[PDB]
Amino acid sequence: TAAVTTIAEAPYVMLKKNAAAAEGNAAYEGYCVALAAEIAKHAGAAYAAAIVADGKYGARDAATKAWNGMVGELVYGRAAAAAAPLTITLVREEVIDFSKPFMS
Amino acid sequence: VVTTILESPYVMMKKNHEMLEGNERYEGYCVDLAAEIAKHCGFKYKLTIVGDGKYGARDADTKIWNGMVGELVYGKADIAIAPLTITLVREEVIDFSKPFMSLGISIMIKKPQKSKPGVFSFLDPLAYEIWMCIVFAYIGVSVVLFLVSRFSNEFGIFNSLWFSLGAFMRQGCDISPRSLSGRIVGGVWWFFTLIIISSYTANLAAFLTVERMVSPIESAEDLSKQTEIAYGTLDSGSTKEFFRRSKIAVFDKMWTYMRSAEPSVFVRTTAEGVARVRKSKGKYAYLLESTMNEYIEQRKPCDTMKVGGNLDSKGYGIATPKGSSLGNAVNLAVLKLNEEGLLDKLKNKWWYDKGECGSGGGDSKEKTSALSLSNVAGVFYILVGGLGLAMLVALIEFCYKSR
Amino acid sequence: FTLIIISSYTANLAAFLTVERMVSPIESAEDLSKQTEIAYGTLDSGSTKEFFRRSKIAVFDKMWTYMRSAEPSVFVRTTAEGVARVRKSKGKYAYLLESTMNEYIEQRKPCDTMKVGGNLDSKGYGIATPKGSSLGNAVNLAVLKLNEEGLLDKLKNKW
Amino acid sequence: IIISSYTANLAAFLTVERMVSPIESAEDLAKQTEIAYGTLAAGSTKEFFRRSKIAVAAKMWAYMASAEPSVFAATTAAGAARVRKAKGKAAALLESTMNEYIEQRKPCDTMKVGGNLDSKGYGAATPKGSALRAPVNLAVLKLAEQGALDKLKNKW
Amino acid sequence: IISSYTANLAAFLTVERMVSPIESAEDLAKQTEIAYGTLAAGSTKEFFRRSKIAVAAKMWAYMASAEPSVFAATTAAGAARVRKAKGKAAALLESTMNEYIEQRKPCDTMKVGGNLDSKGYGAATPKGSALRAPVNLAVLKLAEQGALDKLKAKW
Ligand SMILES: O=c1[nH]c2cc(C(F)(F)F)c(N3CCOCC3)cc2n(CP(=O)(O)O)c1=O
Ligand SMILES: O=c1[nH]c2cc(C(F)(F)F)c(N3CCOCC3)cc2n(CP(=O)(O)O)c1=O
Ligand SMILES: O=c1[nH]c2cc(C(F)(F)F)c(N3CCOCC3)cc2n(CP(=O)(O)O)c1=O
Numbered sequence: 001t002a003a004v005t006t007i008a009e010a011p012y013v014m015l016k017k018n019a020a021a022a023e024g025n026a027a028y029e030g031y032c033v034a035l036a037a038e039i040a041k042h043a044g045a046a047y048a049a050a051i052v053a054d055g056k057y058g059a060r061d062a063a064t065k066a067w068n069g070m071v072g073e074l075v076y077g078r079a080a081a082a083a084a085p086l087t088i089t090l091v092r093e094e095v096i097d098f099s100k101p102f103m104s
Numbered sequence: 105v106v107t108t109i110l111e112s113p114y115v116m117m118k119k120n121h122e123m124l125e126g127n128e129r130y131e132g133y134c135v136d137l138a139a140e141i142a143k144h145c146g147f148k149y150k151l152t153i154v155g156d157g158k159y160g161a162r163d164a165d166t167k168i169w170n171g172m173v174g175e176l177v178y179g180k181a182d183i184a185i186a187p188l189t190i191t192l193v194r195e196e197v198i199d200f201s202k203p204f205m206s207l208g209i210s211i212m213i214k215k216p217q218k219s220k221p222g223v224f225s226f227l228d229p230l231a232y233e234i235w236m237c238i239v240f241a242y243i244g245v246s247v248v249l250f251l252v253s254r255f256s257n258e259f260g261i262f263n264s265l266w267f268s269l270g271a272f273m274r275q276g277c278d279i280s281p282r283s284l285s286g287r288i289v290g291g292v293w294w295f296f297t298l299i300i301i302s303s304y305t306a307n308l309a310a311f312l313t314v315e316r317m318v319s320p321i322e323s324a325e326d327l328s329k330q331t332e333i334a335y336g337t338l339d340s341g342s343t344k345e346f347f348r349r350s351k352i353a354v355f356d357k358m359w360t361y362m363r364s365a366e367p368s369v370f371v372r373t374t375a376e377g378v379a380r381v382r383k384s385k386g387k388y389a390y391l392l393e394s395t396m397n398e399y400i401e402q403r404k405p406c407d408t409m410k411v412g413g414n415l416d417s418k419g420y421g422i423a424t425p426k427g428s429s430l431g432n433a434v435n436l437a438v439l440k441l442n443e444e445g446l447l448d449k450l451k452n453k454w455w456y457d458k459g460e461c462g463s464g465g466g467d468s469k470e471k472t473s474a475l476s477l478s479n480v481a482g483v484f485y486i487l488v489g490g491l492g493l494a495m496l497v498a499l500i501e502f503c504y505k506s507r
Numbered sequence: 508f509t510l511i512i513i514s515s516y517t518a519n520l521a522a523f524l525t526v527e528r529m530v531s532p533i534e535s536a537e538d539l540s541k542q543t544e545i546a547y548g549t550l551d552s553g554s555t556k557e558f559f560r561r562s563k564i565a566v567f568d569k570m571w572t573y574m575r576s577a578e579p580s581v582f583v584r585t586t587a588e589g590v591a592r593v594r595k596s597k598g599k600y601a602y603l604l605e606s607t608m609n610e611y612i613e614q615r616k617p618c619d620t621m622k623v624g625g626n627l628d629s630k631g632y633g634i635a636t637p638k639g640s641s642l643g644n645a646v647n648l649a650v651l652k653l654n655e656e657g658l659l660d661k662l663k664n665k666w
Numbered sequence: 667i668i669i670s671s672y673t674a675n676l677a678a679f680l681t682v683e684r685m686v687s688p689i690e691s692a693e694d695l696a697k698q699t700e701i702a703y704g705t706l707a708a709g710s711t712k713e714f715f716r717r718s719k720i721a722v723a724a725k726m727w728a729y730m731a732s733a734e735p736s737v738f739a740a741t742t743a744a745g746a747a748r749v750r751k752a753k754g755k756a757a758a759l760l761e762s763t764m765n766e767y768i769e770q771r772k773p774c775d776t777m778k779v780g781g782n783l784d785s786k787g788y789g790a791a792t793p794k795g796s797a798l799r800a801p802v803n804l805a806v807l808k809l810a811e812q813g814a815l816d817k818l819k820n821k822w
Numbered sequence: 823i824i825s826s827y828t829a830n831l832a833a834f835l836t837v838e839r840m841v842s843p844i845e846s847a848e849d850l851a852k853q854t855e856i857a858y859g860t861l862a863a864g865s866t867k868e869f870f871r872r873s874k875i876a877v878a879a880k881m882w883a884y885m886a887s888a889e890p891s892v893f894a895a896t897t898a899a900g901a902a903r904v905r906k907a908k909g910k911a912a913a914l915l916e917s918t919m920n921e922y923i924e925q926r927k928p929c930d931t932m933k934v935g936g937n938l939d940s941k942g943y944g945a946a947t948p949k950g951s952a953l954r955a956p957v958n959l960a961v962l963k964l965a966e967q968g969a970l971d972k973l974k975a976k977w
Contacts, residue, residue: 002798011767011822031822038814039790042805043798074793081802082791085763087710088202089786090439097794099803100190101787102815103763104206104417192807206785226826302673305825309521310680312833351813352820416816445719448784457883465854472837475830480823514828517670522835524678564968564975628971657873660939677832721876 002047003079005070006032008055012085025049035102036083050079057086071096105181107154107172108134113399113454114187115153127151133454137204138185140446141422144437147430152181160194173197176425183430184423187395189342194423199431201422201438204447208414209343210397211324211335212390214381215409216317223482229307230300238300242268245293252285259286272297312472320386323412327389328357335389336362336369338377343391344370346416355415382407391415399455406461532598535624539601540569547601548574548581550589555603556582558628567627594619603627691780695757696722703757704730704737706745711759712738714784723783750775846935850912851877858912859885859892861900866914867893869939878938905930916941 006013013030016022025033025048033049040047058071067075070082071092088098108115115132118124127150135151142149160173169177172184177197190200227235246261246268253259258279259267270277271293281287321327327335335358337343347359362369371377377390378400390397397410422438424431441447477484533539539547547570549556559571574581581600583589589602590612609622634650636643653659689695695703703726705711715727730737739745742760746768749756765778790806792799809815844850850858858881860867870882885892894900897915901923904911920933945961947953964970 011764011771031818034818035790035809035815038809039802039805042808043801045798071791074791077793080793080796080798084790085788086791087786088439088789089710090436090443092791093202093436093439095794096791097796097799098202098789098791099806100195100200100810101203101206101419101789102806102810103819104203104419104785104787190807192804192811195803195807203787206787298669301825302669302676305829306521306673306677306680308826309518309677309829309832309836310684312830313525313681313836314685316684349812352817416813418810442785445717445784449720457880458887462852462854464852469855470837472830472833475826480826483823510824513670514824514831517674518828518832518835520670521674521677521681521832522839524675525681525836526840528839562968564971628968629965654940657875657939661875674832677829681836 002045002081003050004036004047004081004083005050005052005073005079006036006082006084007057007070008051010085013051032084036081039081039083045081047081059091067095105152106138106149107152107175107181107184107186108132109154109159109172109186110157111187113395133450134185134187136450136454137447140441140450141185141434141437144440145430145433149182159188160197162193169197172423176423179425182424182428183434187420188423190419190421197426198423199426199428201424201434202442203419203421204438204442205395205451206417206419207394208417209346209391210394210410210414211321211327211412212378212381212392212397212400212408213319213321213411214384214386214388215407216319216386218315218317221476221479223485225479226483229304229311241296242272245289249281249286249289252289253281253283256283256285268293274301314470319409319411321389321411324358324391324415325354327412328354328361331361333387333389334365334369335391336371336377337391338374339370339372343393378408402455402459402461404460531621531623533601533623536570536627537566539624540566540573543573545599545601546577546581547603548583548589548592549603550586551582551584554630555605590620689757689779692726692783693722696725699729701755701757702733702735702737702752703759704739704745704748705759706742707738707740711761746772746776844912844934847881847938848877851880854884856910856912857888857890857892857907858914859894859900859903860914861897862893862895866916901927901931 010030010032012032013028016027016029019027028049028051036047036049039045052069052073054069054072056069058067058069060067066072070084070086073079074082074096082096085103086092086098088101092098110117113132114134115130118129118131130151138149138151154172154175156171156174158171160169160171162169168174172186172188173194175181176184184198187205188194188200190203194200243265246265249268250259250261250264253264259281263279267277267279271290274297281290321330321333327333337347347355347362350356350359371380371390374392374396377392381388381390382405394410394414401408401410422434424434533542533545539545549559559567559574562568562571583592583602586604586608589604593600593602606622606626613621634646636646687694689698689701695701705715715723715730718724718727737756739748739758742764745758745760749758762778762782769777790802792802806815842849844853844856850856860870870878870885873879873882892911894903894913897919900913900915904913917933917937924932945957947957
């Protein structure tokens with residue numbers, strides 16, 4: 001299995017009503033959850049959505065080169081696929097490998 | 105050894121190509137891109153234009169790539185600094201950069217220019233509802249004046265309709281009401297006519313002073329609904345295949361229309377398409393790649409324009425064969441060029457600075473001309489019609505009274 | 508005749524109300540000397556003041572012998588008081604200052620003033636250096652190159 | 667005199683109202699100075715303007731750097747509120763997707779005008795050198811072809 | 823007919839009233855339908871080529887390519903081209919020559935707008951000569967007493 005790292009709140013991924021009633025990834029619904037279902041059928045991954053805890057997208061802190069959030073949760077091996085709106089930028093690119101944009 | 109292609113705004117042959125030929129002297133947006141990608145990643149490159157002259161594609165039986173894909177899969181050249189629509193098939197055989205330019209299927213229409221003033225244009229300064237309300241207000245005022253002068257006195261219906269009409273057209277009145285209740289009606293109708301005539305004159309002056317042109321169609325969501333304007337693609341390619349493979353409601357409608365429509369709306373080539381848009385009136389709209397449309401609307405005669413957003417987004421890449429050690433040396437440089445604001449500056453210069461026309465110079469450029477007979481003749485027709493009608497009713501009354 | 512005249516009056520009045528044109532009451536210093544309805548004053552003592560005394564050009568001698576004998580005191584204690592007086596009086600006061608200070612002032616808030624007319628007499632700003640310095644000739648060439656590169660103009664434009 | 671005056675001033679009203687041009691692009695907003703525009707406090711949009719080397723962009727940054735009130739907004743929720751309360755005085759500069767979400771799935775007090783100034787995208791990133799690095803690039807490229815990436819946007 | 827005579831007359835008067843002549847270089851940059859040309863080879867064309875200014879580069883991009891040759895071979899030709907063009911041509915020459923032509927020539931032309939760049943004339947002396955300091959003093963003292971402003975206002 002694989003663990004996905006999406007951000008918590010946006011127009012993209014949200015908490016559906018009766019969040020306590022539902023369990024697992026099914027408690028969560030949004031655009032980038034509907035997407036991260038489609039990609040499964042094209043790559044075969046059987047996953048379980050796992051939102052970043054810090055709630056930041058991520059940058060190497062000036063004092064300490066420690067990436068935060070999803071781009072952090074990826075580098076340190078905590079979880080693989082970042083099915084969420086990460087802007088394709090140079091600094092993230094030199095550390096992590098993206099895909100082609102799904103939105104511009 | 106990098107390929108290219110001959111598209112005019114991207115890689116062009118300058119004046120006297122014989123004197124200035126080869127990598128030493130080329131002009132184009134992709135040329136400056138190659139120069140900068142070498143400045144960031146120093147390497148030996150020689151501008152070897154593709155021999156086939158077209159972009160990649162594979163024949164079902166031949167199963168070979170041709171153009172800037174065949175020149176790359178078969179080791180004929182290093183990379184391809186040219187517009188490649190990133191797609192599934194091409195990626196499966198090459199390694200694509202991050203898109204250095206994003207685009208879509210724009211909508212091309214002829215620039216909206218002032219039409220010939222139609223017959224019956226004189227009643228434009230006031231809406232239709234106001235004209236109808238004026239007619240029925242006149243017929244209401246005359247009836248009420250008649251009833252008032254015939255409760256309590258030559259204000260019969262015929263002789264009161266004439267008074268109301270005379271008071272509206274600013275011509276002096278033959279007679280005037282004498283009672284109080286007739287004078288109230290007279291006064292309020294005088295006020296009404298004064299306000300309406302002032303409003304008509306003022307709004308007409310506004311129409312003549314500042315002219316305001318509106319695009320007949322704004323977006324494809326409304327271009328599908330219109331259907332009085334014929335819109336067409338190229339013969340076959342990304343655009344036609346996209347429309348046939350589409351499944352969204354609006355796009356499926358815009359394909360069902362064009363699949364069954366006469367004459368041949370699909371155009372043989374983009375030059376013929378733009379020529380057809382320019383030659384015809386605003387009844388033809390052309391659906392092409394956003395970049396080509398933006399470029400075309402800048403060159404002379406600047407008779408066209410781009411309307412509406414991009415229908416479907418796809419980007420352009422910098423191809424590189426899979427095993428190349430240069431494969432990862434281009435992603436990072438493209439991202440840095442995009443982030444520095446250099447690629448945007450390059451496109452801005454190459455497209456607007458080398459622009460045949462500018463928007464600001466002709467922004468107002470306002471000039472006023474004398475009202476030609478075409479604007480007015482809609483009232484000359486009514487005048488002569490009224491005269492003919494008057495002679496007709498005169499003869500009818502004469503014949504009826506003779507017997 | 509009456510139809511044409513009334514139409515002309517209404518149309519021209521509509522033009523007056525629609526687009527408005529504002530004209531500067533005074534254009535240049537020659538016309539300012541000719542008018543003399545507007546009182547124009549300098550700073551009390553300085554180059555911009557001593558210039559008019561030691562001036563023999565026809566117009567400038569008039570513009571001095573006017574303000575030489577006129578009441579009340581047009582001459583202002585300081586440039587801040589001069590600009591305040593110009594802002595206060597609606598149109599009766601015109602101030603004659605250095606071109607650069609005028610251009611700078613008209614850019615600051617509340618932007619209630621403006622500079623009209625060309626420069627009356629030309630001066631220059633330099634970069635002083637004592638006579639025996641070995642830096643004396645290392646600044647001429649730098650200034651000329653900065654001027655020629657379009658960099659000094661870029662600097663003034665920006666700031 | 668009074669009737670001629672009424673007609674003339676009415677014509678002035680109508681003519682002036684007819685030549686009204688709303689702020690449609692970034693250049694028009696740059697030249698015009700009546701409306702104040704403010705980015706977020708700290709983000710990629712402000713750093714863009716600071717690092718911007720375009721005269722029109724620098725003109726905005728020179729304006730946004732110094733203003734009698736703080737044109738900058740601390741939170742994007744605050745930025746939306748400031749524009750609504752300012753009644754045309756505030757013109758936020760946010761990313762295109764959020765702008766299109768706010769003008770659509772929020773009470774329509776605001777709208778998006780003019781094309782976006784810069785470009786960027788959202789990849790579905792994977793850890794460097796991972797085994798599923800490609801069968802995600804292929805997945806995204808096929809989804810964008812079949813429109814499943816464009817049906818979904820038109821939905822939410 | 824009377825209503826549409828009065829309305830169109832108001833249109834003429836309003837439009838004629840809101841007309842703005844090309845006053846500065848920025849206005850000539852935004853405007854695009856009249857052509858401006860410099861000398862074929864001089865300190866002003868090389869100025870534009872070496873200049874890096876959004877407005878100036880916009881002009882240079884304009885003057886680089888034009889269906890007629892905007893550049894003029896001789897300054898006498900440049901003056902004639904503007905006169906015959908009836909407002910189409912807008913020469914770009916040094917301020918002093920502009921002020922001489924608009925004044926001591928039949929007034930078909932005029933100078934509008936402040937000068938774009940700065941220059942200066944000097945009574946030069948050979949490098950390391952004994953007539954350097956006294957000539958510098960002579961020029962400065964002449965300018966202080968206006969003997970350079972009385973002379974310019976004369977010729
Ligand atoms: O990778 C990034 N992804 C981002 C995703 C979003 C959004 F999805 F829209 F929430 C936003 N917003 C737009 C502006 O209002 C606040 C939220 C910014 C992003 N930024 C720049 P940040 O402002 O530094 O986070 C990134 O760099
Ligand atoms: O990979 C491709 N890249 C392409 C790039 C371009 C352009 F960007 F314009 F250079 C164009 N044109 C569109 C109309 O203007 C002239 C040519 C076609 C391309 N096609 C063929 P399609 O399938 O019709 O898009 C490809 O296959
Ligand atoms: O060398 C001199 N350089 C000067 C430069 C300036 C300015 F450029 F403006 F800073 C001024 N001001 C004029 C009004 O605005 C504020 C002060 C005075 C100067 N003076 C005194 P002056 O003799 O009265 O001209 C000099 O002597």
